[PDB]
Amino acid sequence: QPEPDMITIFIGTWNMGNAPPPKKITSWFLSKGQGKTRDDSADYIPHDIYVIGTQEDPLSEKEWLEILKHSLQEITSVTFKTVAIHTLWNIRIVVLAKPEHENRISHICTDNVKTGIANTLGNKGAVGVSFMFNGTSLGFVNSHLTSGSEKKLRRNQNYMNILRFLALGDKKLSPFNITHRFTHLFWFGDLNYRVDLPTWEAETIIQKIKQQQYADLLSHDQLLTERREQKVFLHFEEEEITFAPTYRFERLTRDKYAYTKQKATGMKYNLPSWCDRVLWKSYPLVHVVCQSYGSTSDIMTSDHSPVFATFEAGVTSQFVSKNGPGTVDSQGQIEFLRCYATLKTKSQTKFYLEFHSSCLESFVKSQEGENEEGSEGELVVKFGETLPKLKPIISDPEYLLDQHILISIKSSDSDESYGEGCIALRLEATETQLPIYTPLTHHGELTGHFQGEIKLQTSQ
Ligand SMILES: Cc1cc(N2CCNCC2)nc(C)n1
Numbered sequence: 001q002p003e004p005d006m007i008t009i010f011i012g013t014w015n016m017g018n019a020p021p022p023k024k025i026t027s028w029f030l031s032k033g034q035g036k037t038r039d040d041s042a043d044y045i046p047h048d049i050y051v052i053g054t055q056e057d058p059l060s061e062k063e064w065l066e067i068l069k070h071s072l073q074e075i076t077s078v079t080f081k082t083v084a085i086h087t088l089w090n091i092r093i094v095v096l097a098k099p100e101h102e103n104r105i106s107h108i109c110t111d112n113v114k115t116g117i118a119n120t121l122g123n124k125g126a127v128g129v130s131f132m133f134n135g136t137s138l139g140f141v142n143s144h145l146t147s148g149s150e151k152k153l154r155r156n157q158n159y160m161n162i163l164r165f166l167a168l169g170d171k172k173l174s175p176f177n178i179t180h181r182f183t184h185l186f187w188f189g190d191l192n193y194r195v196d197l198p199t200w201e202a203e204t205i206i207q208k209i210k211q212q213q214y215a216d217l218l219s220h221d222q223l224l225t226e227r228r229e230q231k232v233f234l235h236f237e238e239e240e241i242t243f244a245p246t247y248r249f250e251r252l253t254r255d256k257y258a259y260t261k262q263k264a265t266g267m268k269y270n271l272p273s274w275c276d277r278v279l280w281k282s283y284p285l286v287h288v289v290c291q292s293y294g295s296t297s298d299i300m301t302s303d304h305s306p307v308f309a310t311f312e313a314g315v316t317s318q319f320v321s322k323n324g325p326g327t328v329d330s331q332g333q334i335e336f337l338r339c340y341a342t343l344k345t346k347s348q349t350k351f352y353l354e355f356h357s358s359c360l361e362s363f364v365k366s367q368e369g370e371n372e373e374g375s376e377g378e379l380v381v382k383f384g385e386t387l388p389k390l391k392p393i394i395s396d397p398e399y400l401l402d403q404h405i406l407i408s409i410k411s412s413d414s415d416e417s418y419g420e421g422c423i424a425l426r427l428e429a430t431e432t433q434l435p436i437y438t439p440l441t442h443h444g445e446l447t448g449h450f451q452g453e454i455k456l457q458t459s460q
């Protein structure tokens, strides 16, 4: 029974509007409706992992699990196993997987973050799940961010609190937040970003939706514009949106957008918006391909339509050699040449690096770099040829070329990370000096760059 090198992952996000679902929700898991939809010929083919995010979910975990498992069984004839379920208030995440994966999935972790203070603490935040799938780490975040067209900045703040404080994945990766801890990270939910057009244009927007002319609406989508200006979700991907706005509908039909201000909305307009989103971030040069991104047309119990996205995701096998795990493989080494970090910091402390990777027995601390002034004001930290030679646990190229090195640049004074990034070992050549590069972030914001050269020695 061979270990897979690809799996498919279903991501669902649905704000249920505090209403029980209708009796049939199979269209969601089949990626049928509007947008980038799944071919009919695939309907019986189960995804490897289904990750369901709900917001305003009125069901118990038991009630929702029963509905999900019965849905998937009807579609696939497979009885899925529950990997994890985690609920904060009415925000929920469920992970289901094919039974054949039960002994491929380990290190299952759940957490939540509550966003806001006093007034704004009580119903918004995020839940998440992480685990290993063979040699691949997977993380999943379902967030319900602050609502309202005039709160895009609050949403961006909610994003940064969630990526800082959600404690998923390997805690030995202490300098790294969730945006670096996983081979593949999927972040979805009712992100609540709106189409920022004047209230007076509501009927014009509705017209555009009826014509399936989304271009002039998406050009005003706050998540697309905030992402373009690097205010949120830096280094994440989103598939092109080709489905109608998923909010705000009159219930029991999809024929009407309910946008006008009401006491029940706090006298706020809800112009048709793409509130419900799926984004991802995978390590460099790992296979990840979005195969669907759309909304259902036939599930109408909520003022939101469910969103689906499916992905091909590259996975690696749990590698065993005669040497590693449990020793090094003398035949393997990673060398860094002519490396320098460029930092946006106004601080003058010395900096050192940490290299973290599953291909190492434990992380490696460098010597301090040499600070110089860059020509445009920047701090440049030069490492020269001073960086430690990394000793991977396995030298086999089939293993080593699939690995990644996380880099943190830390202050000598405070041991606080000023920047985090990631370097793929999927090189064009071994035993060859080759350029490497990663942006550096801290709390998910750009703080600099790391670049230089690598020379990778494998047993071939
Ligand atoms: C909690 C956790 C740990 C972990 N690792 C990788 C295997 N060895 C132990 C450390 N990986 C993930 C995704 N989560």
Ligand SMILES: Cc1cc(N2CCNCC2)nc(C)n1
Binding pocket: 227, 228, 234, 235, 236, 237
């Ligand atoms: C034009 C553009 C590109 C981008 N990328 C691309 C490669 N990795 C993820 C980040 N993100 C945005 C918001 N805009």
